[PDB]
Amino acid sequence: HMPRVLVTGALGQIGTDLSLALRDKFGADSVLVSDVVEPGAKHPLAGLKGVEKLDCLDSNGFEKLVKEFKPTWMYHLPAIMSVRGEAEPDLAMDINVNTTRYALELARKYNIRIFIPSTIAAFGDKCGKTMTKDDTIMNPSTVYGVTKVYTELLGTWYRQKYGVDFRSVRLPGIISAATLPGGGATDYAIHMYHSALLQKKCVCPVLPYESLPMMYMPDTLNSLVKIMEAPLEKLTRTVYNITGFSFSPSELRFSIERCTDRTIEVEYVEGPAQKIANSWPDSLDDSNARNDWGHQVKYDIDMMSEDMLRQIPILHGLPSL
Amino acid sequence: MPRVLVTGALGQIGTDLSLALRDKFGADSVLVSDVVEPGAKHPLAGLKGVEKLDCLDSNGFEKLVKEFKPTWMYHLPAIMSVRGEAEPDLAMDINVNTTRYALELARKYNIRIFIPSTIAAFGDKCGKTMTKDDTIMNPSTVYGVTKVYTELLGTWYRQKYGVDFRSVRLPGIISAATLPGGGATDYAIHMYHSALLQKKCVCPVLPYESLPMMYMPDTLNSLVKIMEAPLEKLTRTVYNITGFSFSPSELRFSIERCTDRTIEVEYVEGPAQKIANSWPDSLDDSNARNDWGHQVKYDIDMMSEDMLRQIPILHGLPSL
Ligand SMILES: NC(=O)C1=CN([C@@H]2O[C@H](COP(=O)(O)OP(=O)(O)OC[C@H]3O[C@@H](n4cnc5c(N)ncnc54)[C@H](O)[C@@H]3O)[C@@H](O)[C@H]2O)C=CC1
Ligand SMILES: NC(=O)C1=CN([C@@H]2O[C@H](COP(=O)(O)OP(=O)(O)OC[C@H]3O[C@@H](n4cnc5c(N)ncnc54)[C@H](O)[C@@H]3O)[C@@H](O)[C@H]2O)C=CC1
Ligand SMILES: C[C@@H](O)[C@H](N)C(=O)O
Ligand SMILES: C[C@@H](O)[C@H](N)C(=O)O
Ligand code: NA
Ligand code: NA
């Protein structure tokens, strides 16, 4: 049978495109998408059935929703990310720790296959910055990263103790056109496309040769589905690195200027994103993911930049050609 | 002379640590607290500067710290390996939230803060022989999971805010005064009691499962020394320390050498065994030795002599 899929924190950058892909793939009646906020008037999930409000900090309301829908899969997405978590750490520790605790308990009690994403932010400067391994020293420099190490370890314990089918990937920076990003260090990339279409100066808070692992949303969606469709027997671990390709702001800029045939104005003025990003790996080793469940990546930076420069005007109404 | 707050003070470590701090620094300079009040036979009963505080009551915790103005804090409340696997919601509440509250008070009220970690923070990928200070951490217990969180959170407080967070990964700690709180290494203490009562000891750790351990007097020396060290000596926030490693069969032999009497011990593969088997056999504590002079006086036989002398005195068990 097709799965019944619950998405929590579903209205954000990842949730928006994942929810659309799941409804398309499995049918709208087999998918329940939820978030603590309502879709805004321009949000692609506005006016649709199967969209609920849920604050995942309310464990009793989380249970009620799970009881009623009876999911077989859950993608638990709420988290406060790197830059915002440094400014709002008490909020990051509440959401990132307690919502995860609650989601895992419900996966236990209701026999749900549960995906909680981790992040390159779980790594710090001791990880081995080149082709970082799946198992290595983790010394995250942000409270977000600290909370995502805890997530990985706590999920893994739920699998060992109770047999909860917990699965996770360490996502790189995710690029998409649909929903603006939620305040991480990689957010500059999305913002540089908007500046280029508006012909405005881009003030980039990440320095020009700071390379980071990144991935374009279509590849991300294929992997998020693939890892959840895999039989449990095929998975040799609970947490996998995945990457798309790495780039620096200067490489992103060169790619956009190739597509628009048009020089863009960028000022590099260091923001908190920089020192955060500088502590992250430059690239990841994702061989285990490729071997166990078939992770792959089809987009390169120029393909991405062609697609983003097309989609942003369509979805957000900015000047195109 | 510092002003020292100890939370979780009525337990195995806190009982002895609290007495040692009062003796070194003066009773007037040491305030200790616990969620429970001490019973009439507790070593801390009847002493001034022993308060009732639930560290999950953040306003109460803040009130106490503000009034006393500690310069040092030892934050000891935690649910340990065996008990945490049976009561994991309590472990996650206590081990994560009280730690978060303690670090926030250390930041706001300028306190040098010690929070112990543990060998439980390691699992089967750590390199179980002479485990390094920096390695892969894959703990198999919710207690260990929460202690990796504690180390990484405390380290983030130091990097971000300049808070003087200090930690060691403690081995199994042996002492006579206060019975232990539900960890896998508790068999060791229980075997000395069984030997003195001449009862059969049912040991839930298999006979050759060796673990890092330390006797309390060495523990107390190091817990003070690390806190006294100047920052310029410390290259790390979290240090391994160890005393010596032993298995249950080794302990049994040490006890039988003292009493010249055989103890009846039945070994079984209990919950403790599956936990203990995931932990290191020995630790590399070279960084702690080099940076701040961690040192160990007791070996297994000295320890056993002292324990068999002290348990009768402190608990009324039959002597010799
Ligand atoms: N965007 C990225 O590059 C990466 C994201 N991931 C992660 O994947 C996740 C989803 O990320 P994004 O979609 O980019 O974040 P986002 O910030 O765009 O979306 C997060 C959503 O969570 C919801 N939320 C916050 N608190 C909630 C609560 N108490 N209950 C229910 N919903 C709540 C928000 O309203 C929001 O719509 C996270 O766990 C994040 O760490 C990890 C790595 C990469
Ligand atoms: N005993 C050992 O072998 C080892 C202990 N450590 C640790 O050192 C610590 C102290 O350990 P033990 O003395 O052996 O534990 P214990 O279980 O003997 O003492 C814990 C004490 O904390 C108190 N407590 C629990 N909840 C509290 C709360 N909400 N507010 C205030 N007090 C609360 C208990 O009443 C208690 O007296 C822990 O953090 C533990 O992880 C780490 C490694 C070795
Ligand atoms: C990389 C991921 O964790 C997120 N976009 C961040 O920058 O925090
Ligand atoms: C070793 C320490 O963490 C504790 N005595 C336990 O056995 O859990
Ligand atoms: Na980097
Ligand atoms: Na061991």
Side-chain angles (χ1 to χ4, degrees):
Chain A
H1 279 96
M2 288 179 147
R4 287 180 69 75
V5 190
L6 174 61
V7 185
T8 62
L11 298 183
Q13 189 191 350
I14 303 318
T16 291
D17 284 312
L18 177 66
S19 296
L20 293 165
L22 289 168
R23 286 167 59 98
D24 181 64
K25 180 172 185 74
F26 301 123
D29 286 346
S30 285
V31 181
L32 183 67
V33 310
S34 70
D35 199 288
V36 70
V37 311
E38 290 263 41
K42 306 194 142 194
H43 198 285
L45 291 162
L48 305 178
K49 282 177 173 190
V51 180
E52 296 293 327
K53 218 140 147 202
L54 172 62
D55 186 347
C56 286
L57 291 165
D58 177 11
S59 72
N60 286 171
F62 200 168
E63 184 158 11
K64 183 181 184 281
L65 185 61
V66 162
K67 270 185 64 142
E68 294 169 336
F69 179 66
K70 303 178 171 68
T72 61
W73 290 13
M74 179 186 342
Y75 286 95
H76 181 66
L77 307 184
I80 300 300
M81 301 175 287
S82 62
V83 173
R84 178 134 90 129
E86 296 302 277
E88 304 186 57
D90 289 334
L91 187 67
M93 285 178 280
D94 289 348
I95 297 289
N96 296 8
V97 170
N98 294 319
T99 72
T100 292
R101 176 194 177 158
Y102 304 151
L104 290 161
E105 265 297 275
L106 289 169
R108 183 187 62 79
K109 297 181 51 156
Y110 296 98
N111 301 128
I112 312 167
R113 182 176 296 169
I114 179 173
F115 180 85
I116 319 193
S118 191
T119 173
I120 61 165
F123 295 118
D125 65 13
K126 310 178 182 188
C127 61
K129 257 215 182 179
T130 305
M131 297 306 288
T132 310
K133 305 273 287 316
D134 275 320
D135 295 320
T136 189
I137 295 161
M138 314 289 281
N139 80 309
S141 82
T142 59
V143 68
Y144 171 57
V146 170
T147 67
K148 286 300 200 176
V149 173
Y150 182 67
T151 293
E152 292 179 14
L153 293 177
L154 185 67
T156 302
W157 180 72
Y158 265 80
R159 160 82 185 274
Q160 299 180 357
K161 181 68 178 173
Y162 301 116
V164 169
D165 185 356
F166 164 70
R167 307 185 177 192
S168 183
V169 307
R170 302 201 181 97
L171 288 176
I174 306 311
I175 305 300
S176 57
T179 288
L180 283 147
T186 55
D187 292 22
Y188 84 86
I190 294 168
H191 300 305
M192 186 174 297
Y193 285 106
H194 290 246
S195 300
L197 285 169
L198 293 168
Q199 309 206 236
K200 292 315 199 199
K201 106 167 154 199
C202 175
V203 178
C204 185
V206 172
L207 298 172
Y209 296 174
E210 186 65 59
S211 200
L212 286 170
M214 300 274 201
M215 194 173 298
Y216 192 40
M217 184 66 77
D219 292 319
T220 312
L221 298 175
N222 287 155
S223 285
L224 290 173
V225 176
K226 216 171 213 186
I227 200 174
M228 288 292 269
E229 289 186 314
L232 184 51
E233 303 188 339
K234 296 197 126 187
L235 308 187
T236 64
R237 50 181 51 248
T238 53
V239 186
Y240 295 87
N241 287 343
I242 69 174
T243 193
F245 51 94
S246 289
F247 62 85
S248 67
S250 64
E251 301 173 309
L252 190 58
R253 180 189 190 173
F254 188 80
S255 167
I256 285 169
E257 293 176 334
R258 253 182 308 195
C259 296
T260 62
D261 219 309
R262 190 169 80 194
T263 235
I264 66 176
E265 184 180 30
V266 177
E267 290 191 14
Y268 291 103
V269 182
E270 237 205 66
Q274 177 58 30
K275 194 167 185 278
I276 293 166
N278 188 68
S279 70
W280 296 351
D282 298 318
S283 66
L284 308 178
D285 182 343
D286 64 3
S287 68
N288 292 318
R290 282 180 201 269
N291 301 339
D292 290 3
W293 50 265
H295 169 65
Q296 58 194 322
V297 170
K298 304 285 185 188
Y299 276 85
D300 68 13
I301 195 174
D302 299 326
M303 288 167 78
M304 173 172 80
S305 288
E306 293 160 30
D307 198 62
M308 282 287 282
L309 290 159
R310 294 184 308 251
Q311 292 268 105
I312 286 161
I314 292 168
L315 297 166
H316 283 271
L318 303 200
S320 71
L321 56 99
Chain B
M1 290 254 291
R3 291 172 71 70
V4 186
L5 171 59
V6 184
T7 61
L10 298 184
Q12 188 192 349
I13 295 183
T15 290
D16 282 324
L17 178 63
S18 292
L19 288 167
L21 293 166
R22 290 166 61 100
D23 195 53
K24 190 164 184 178
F25 296 132
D28 274 349
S29 292
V30 180
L31 175 62
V32 312
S33 68
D34 200 280
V35 60
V36 169
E37 310 220 355
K41 306 225 309 202
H42 197 287
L44 302 183
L47 304 180
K48 188 178 180 170
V50 177
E51 309 284 318
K52 186 196 192 52
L53 172 66
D54 182 349
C55 286
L56 286 174
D57 169 6
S58 53
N59 294 158
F61 193 2
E62 179 158 12
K63 186 164 193 304
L64 185 151
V65 162
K66 277 172 37 75
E67 290 181 13
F68 180 61
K69 306 194 217 331
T71 68
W72 296 359
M73 178 180 9
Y74 293 93
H75 186 69
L76 307 178
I79 308 302
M80 294 176 291
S81 57
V82 173
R83 190 170 171 207
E85 295 301 276
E87 297 183 58
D89 303 315
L90 185 68
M92 290 182 289
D93 293 349
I94 290 283
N95 304 357
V96 169
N97 294 323
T98 70
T99 298
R100 167 183 185 166
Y101 298 151
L103 290 162
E104 194 64 348
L105 294 165
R107 182 182 70 83
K108 288 174 167 176
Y109 299 105
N110 194 17
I111 319 172
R112 182 177 298 162
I113 182 178
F114 179 87
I115 312 177
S117 188
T118 170
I119 54 169
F122 296 119
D124 66 9
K125 295 167 179 188
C126 66
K128 281 161 75 181
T129 311
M130 300 300 285
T131 312
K132 304 318 183 218
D133 275 324
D134 291 322
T135 187
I136 297 158
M137 312 294 276
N138 73 313
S140 78
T141 61
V142 66
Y143 168 54
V145 175
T146 65
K147 292 288 191 182
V148 173
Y149 185 66
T150 296
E151 290 179 19
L152 292 181
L153 191 70
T155 302
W156 174 80
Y157 264 79
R158 164 81 186 145
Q159 293 177 6
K160 171 77 155 166
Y161 298 118
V163 166
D164 191 357
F165 167 74
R166 299 187 189 193
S167 186
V168 299
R169 298 189 184 102
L170 286 175
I173 305 307
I174 301 309
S175 63
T178 288
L179 289 175
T185 56
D186 294 15
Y187 81 87
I189 287 160
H190 297 315
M191 189 187 291
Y192 285 103
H193 281 255
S194 298
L196 291 149
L197 304 157
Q198 306 189 228
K199 328 272 192 171
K200 188 186 66 160
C201 169
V202 164
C203 187
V205 178
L206 293 174
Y208 318 118
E209 188 64 51
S210 182
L211 288 171
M213 303 268 196
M214 191 167 323
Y215 195 39
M216 186 72 73
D218 293 323
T219 306
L220 296 177
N221 187 257
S222 290
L223 295 168
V224 177
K225 197 159 189 179
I226 195 173
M227 284 291 273
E228 288 183 326
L231 271 175
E232 61 268 29
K233 283 181 143 198
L234 300 191
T235 61
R236 308 181 53 80
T237 48
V238 186
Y239 291 87
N240 287 345
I241 67 175
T242 194
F244 45 92
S245 289
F246 65 82
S247 63
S249 62
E250 292 176 328
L251 187 65
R252 184 183 183 178
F253 285 131
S254 181
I255 293 172
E256 294 173 338
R257 286 196 285 282
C258 290
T259 60
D260 274 24
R261 216 162 52 206
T262 307
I263 34 182
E264 189 194 344
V265 175
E266 201 209 304
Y267 300 105
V268 304
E269 184 157 22
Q273 166 62 25
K274 193 189 171 227
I275 288 168
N277 195 64
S278 70
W279 291 346
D281 300 322
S282 49
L283 304 184
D284 186 340
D285 59 359
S286 68
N287 289 323
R289 289 185 190 261
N290 295 341
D291 292 1
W292 50 271
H294 168 57
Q295 56 179 47
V296 171
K297 173 173 205 287
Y298 288 77
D299 61 23
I300 192 168
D301 292 334
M302 308 174 48
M303 174 175 75
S304 288
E305 283 181 50
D306 195 67
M307 286 280 285
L308 291 165
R309 202 187 75 237
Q310 296 221 50
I311 289 168
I313 294 178
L314 292 161
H315 300 259
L317 297 233
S319 88
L320 284 188

